[PDB]
């Protein structure tokens, strides 16, 4: 049980002490990054390099200890067991990132100024997001909106290319105020387009001829929205997903469905072997198998609807079931009354 | 292929071409299950692929074609097992598994539950690793 | 069947091999575009022109072969058959674009530097989106939100015009730091407005007099949203359309509705001819026609609701139908009981 | 115009001005169709334009005014045909068309289906181009 | 009927000829505005002034004729009748705008260069949006979201003020590259804030001291969203309003409700006079009035629900009504069966 | 009652006179802020300081009077009573802000130019939002979307860090046009990233080497949306919350639920004491307590659903209840009919 | 004020304090309207302000306090009239008004409709300006 | 802990392990409350934690474990009191509290309401501060 407690304290936290520990390690990483930023300036290079070297070595020792403890504690789960289980646990992207950070830091320390340690701590800053919880939500939403994040990233890109080419044609030969050709080549016009369709507008390149200015005015008001569309799409998707989560079915309403699914699956598995205890409730063999298959399919169909949130489909199907039962009862009452009389 | 024709023939009981809900209920009564009309309607709707309320032979072939052991079914069974499993791990205690299967859903008989426990908790521990059990099926 | 296989492999792909082929041709087009961009720079002009000429001629030969193969394979569908069917297939905008690209490339090669080949390959970059799948979604969403994409593009435009005129009046005579009149004419103020209401802000034109700065501050916080509104509207529309697609009716629930619609339409058609087999189930002629018309209208009404996703309207109408049936059964039971007693 | 008055008169059967559901059911029983109350209510609601539950003479004229051959109806019939058609093309095999029309929806008689096939699959091929068939109607 | 036809052709168009007329007049106004823009440049001032004078006089004559025709044709509606009806019609904001444009243009022509004619035609550009159809939708949506467009325009404004003051304190005394104090006074810092919290970023004012840059970095990522929030709110509101319009009740389902409402209101009105024909179906006078009041309230309650789109409230109330009716029928059947036996 | 009237007039206004008073005080504060802004400019410093001193002293006297009146009137509510009630009322953040403003203004006046009075009036500008009504909505929406405002502020931040580091590596040694190293240190690159991923784009720092420009182009189109995502998320959340408020249950449908909840809670409380009047409807003591506990839990469950808006859950549960009642009635009718016959 | 007590007393018929649906139905039967249970429930729910299903005396006073002639009611009646009015104008032909009121909703008697027409279409034209008619009420 | 076993045993009345709705109704009838089937189903669903429609002993222990005086319950009771309280303050007049508890919801007896008033409005004022009353419970 101690292994499970350690695993729960390190990965998938559920309390305040684990939250405090994770916030502390994240704050230490952030402070190390800030010190690295201050050391990148030549003014503070006198002792920032040495203090960062000491902080980096103590931090990599701490991360190695934490990683070996987590690897030992990963045996709690059924998937990670034995020797191959640890290797499968190390296959996870977060574990790969941690191992790469530790190994690269050790290599850099062995091989006194460090140049890549800034990138190493930038990568280390990713250590906070455990079990991919932050990335999974974005991945799910992008996958849901896959057919609309491509339309906005293909029509927008095509409009960008066409508008940049038109601006380049309009302002190909136009000397700026300082005598430097703004849109000398198509690459410069493409850079200007990537700067304009994203509402950045540095101001290094500005169309000069009135034709280029007119084209930029006519296209900016239209084609800019095709690049801000993914932000709105993902935001509305996040809001709708939160709203649906607000209307989730209670956790106690899927336990019977799961029990039925597991029981039907086991019955179907046991029906394969003729010498089994499942044959308690010769041509009947081909009939019981079909019945068990239909029962398994029904149980699987109900379980999926049990896990899904409440919806109009549930209301209409439940009313259909209730109406069928009521009609059967009315019919049997009428039949009994007619038979008696 | 030819076996399904024999299976379809006995369910029909009249040789018309459609497995009506009444025919399925008659077959179940012959087996001795005593189902409910709502359950029969749900089974027919799950099997039916044309929405006409009756099972056709192509629909029966489609139902008998797709089988278990697929990823979309193994994952579903694993999630169903996870529903019962507490403490987030992949181990279910034998007492919880035995208690649930005899009460919730369709109550299995004692012999069936004992066989399930023996086939699942093959090792001597008091907890059955449902992952290996699902992989066995 | 080989013609249908070729048509499915080229247009409307459904597998991985077709996906690989389309991705490969799109990547080839993109690489050609990148090489054209690098050739537009005078530094790389030595051999980029020649290698692009060779790549362009081989690519236009490949595209001509692909287009003739697609034209031959388009005969699979019923609409495209014979000689007029091929011409009708060539009327599609994507086919027109491909034909224009091929013909223009051939003309340019015949008439060794090529100036318009950059625009030709920019147009060729549109070849990836087959059957207008990318454009159809955007067109449908814009058509749905037609009454709200005009309000934001009319109030926003009017606010832009008024604010630009007010800024021009405020800063008509104000020499900048370099001695150049920023808002010399109304055209310059309009360009500044088009640059500001789109959150671009190049910085070439900035109001100088405090009146112009005050007007720009008071209007920017308000009138900018009227131009970012289309992006939010379209994003929320895309998200809601995805959510509705998540709640679509099963494909097997519309087959009986389609069958009823087709049968009723055929019965109505056959009722026109008195000598037909439809008269198996003289003044009755005027009565059967009305019955068949009503049946056809009902079948058409049900089919449209069958294709539409689940909605509260379906639940309420289905409950009304079930309640009417149940009330009829209760009434007949009561009538039979009263008649017996 | 005057013909609709004769058609409306026989449906009414009482000369009041409204075609009640009972009157429509009586007319259908005279024809010999034996409908259901739900079907009659659906027909009335489809025809009714005032929501009062009864068919008025202006409503009957409105129903008899709009007819088929419009784009909004030809497209609907083409989509209904596409529902049955597989492989994405515009050709439906004669066997599938004959099988569907005799089972799904309202089951047509054999003579009607044979006439439909003859009028639709005029050419000797085994597949009926539903596009030309819809254009014929 | 000719007056009604003229009024429908001018105001609230419903065909293609009226659409063509309105598009033509809008295009004429836009072309006049473009010519005014080109005339504002000193290069084209030679004859643009004269041609614009002629176009303006012919256009104001045309607008006067159109306005007098519309004023004559406004008598079709019941509200605009007689002399006071025309004055009430002229009270509408669009009519006021048209009258102001015509009168101001006449005054300018009487009093040859025209300076305010540019503003007059800018105002004339508003003539296209008839019956306030464009403005009504935005007004309704803003009124619906009134409690959330104030939160974003009050927290955002407060954050802007605080951040601008902090930046001013950080960079109060910091000479720029050119030797000019960027944030010399609080007004300059406020202008910088209004430029930054709106993602404009002209670049005229950029914080120089690292404290100001740090404050701008820490606040820009957070407080910018509080200013782009109104755009997202209004966009999502527009999308949801369109979705609700997609689920509107059929127009034929509210006619009985309107009839019941009008009949109950008239019955309540007639109940005031004892000598009336409404007393066909002495202390009963005080009882019939209460019954008619309750009937009127019920009819008004149903009519509002009839005009509102389909909703879960309608489903639940309709099921409650149906269940009550069914329970009453079951109870009466049971009572009759018990009484008979 | 006069104390309650004063409290309602000052806090939580509900009329027009209170609205006029609050708008007047807000306008006075805004005018004082504008005068402070004008005084920050050295041109107007001659008498603006003196007039602002007089306005500030009269305004702080007025605010002290208003605060003492509000403190006296806060005794109307049950929570604020006696001496400790006033202290608990003063613990509210708005009361703390008002007290801090008054005390700081008095201290500044006692200790003639005032430097911090600008910040004091900036803080005073927060006085308008009473009872935290503006902040509560934003806090609730952020708390609802807590798991999605962190994903966008963590993936966006990580992308910003990585992109800034890559740009710094690409353009570490690149002299600008003026001979000044743009990305001299990592701090400059981070500032450029914070300026670019927020669509600000001042133009002070622009990548020069083509590698940096390519990296900025490739990342700007993607990672910018991760920073505009919170705006869209909060906007869609606000719109959905407004839509849900449009579908709220009537206030008269929760009074019976509240009555049942209070009565069941009081019954459970009284069941603790054996000598009570609740024992009017020895081992039965352990049974009545369980019954009262279940009744209290049911009443609490219904009250929460009563306060929540209409939803599909309400429809399905209400249909289940109605169907169970109807089935019970049908069963009892059948049982009575069978027993009689 | 005191008049409402007499009105409330006769509706109660038992002197308890609540106007049950049965009591309202009894009063209506005494008048001779023969209502339906659903209509009575709707009336009670419209009048009830506490959700208890019965009318209390404060609720009766609240119902009798608010009256017509308010903007929120005049606008509603004008919109209800606009529902019938075609061609977008503010004039309804007398034939349409007379036909609708005698058929749709609750069918008024001929005398009531004649009085309504006389009071509404006071002028000799064939169309009644519903705006002035609503303003009269 | 051991006390709950005695309480669970008397509710069961058959010694099987599940408190069926019929058993709960029998216990209530023994007490003399005469409940409704819908109320019993609602109580079971509120207590049931496995969705099987019956109360198990672990579910009974879970129900008896969580109690009142928690913040999530005190706040709910305070909001329920606020529902009745007008004028936004925290004082409810004794007349309103006495009138509501004897009519709305489940009508309390006069003795219970008098005891509630005495325990709540301990001071001599005519208004009971519901905040202190809730804090007492
Ligand atoms: Ca059969
Ligand atoms: Ca079938
Ligand atoms: Ca095991
Ligand atoms: Ca009739
Ligand atoms: Ca009618
Ligand atoms: Ca054919
Ligand atoms: Ca009573
Ligand atoms: Ca009441
Ligand atoms: Ca008239
Ligand atoms: Ca039992
Ligand atoms: Ca249980
Ligand atoms: Ca008290």
Numbering used by the authors:
A (entry chain G), C (entry chain E), E (entry chain C), F (entry chain A): 95 to 205, 215 to 384, 497 to 556
B (entry chain H), D (entry chain F), G (entry chain D), H (entry chain B): 10 to 146
What does the paper say about this structure?
The KCNQ1 ion channel plays critical physiological roles in electrical excitability and K+ recycling in organs including the heart, brain, and gut. CaM co-purifies with the C-terminus of KCNQ115, it has complex effects on channel kinetics, and is a required accessory protein in the complex where it is needed for trafficking to the plasmalemma, folding, and tetramerization. Here, we report cryogenic electron microscopic (cryo-EM) structures of Xenopus KCNQ1 bound to Ca2+/Calmodulin, with and without the KCNQ1 channel activator, ML277. We utilized a biochemically stable form of Xenopus KCNQ1 (xKCNQ1, residues 67–610), bound to Ca2+/CaM4 to perform cryo-EM studies in the absence and presence of ML277 (xKCNQ1-CaM and xKCNQ1-CaM-ML277, respectively).
We obtained cryo-EM structures for xKCNQ1-CaM at 3.8 Å and for xKCNQ1-CaM-ML277 at 3.9 Å, both with C4 symmetry imposed. The xKCNQ1-CaM structure is in the same decoupled configuration as the published xKCNQ1-CaM structure, with the voltage sensor domains in the activated state and the pore closed. We observe that the structure of xKCNQ1 alone shows almost complete identity with the density determined by Sun and MacKinnon4, highlighting the accuracy and reproducibility of the techniques used. The high degree of similarity between our apo structure and that of Sun and MacKinnon, suggests that an extra density we see at the proposed binding site when cryo-EM samples are incubated in ML277 is due to the presence of the drug. Thus, two independent data sets with ML277 show density for a ligand at the same location, whereas two data sets without ML277 show the absence of density, which strongly supports the proposed location for ML277. The xKCNQ1-CaM-ML277 structure shows a similar decoupled TM configuration but a differently twisted C-terminal coiled-coil domain. In both structures, CaM was modeled with Ca2+ ions bound to EF hands 1, 2, and 4. The C-terminal coiled-coil displayed a resolution worse than 4 Å and was modeled until residue 556. Our studies do not support such conclusions in so far as they apply to the closed channel with activated voltage sensors, as only a single binding pocket was identified with limited differences between the xKCNQ1-CaM and xKCNQ1-CaM-ML277 structures.
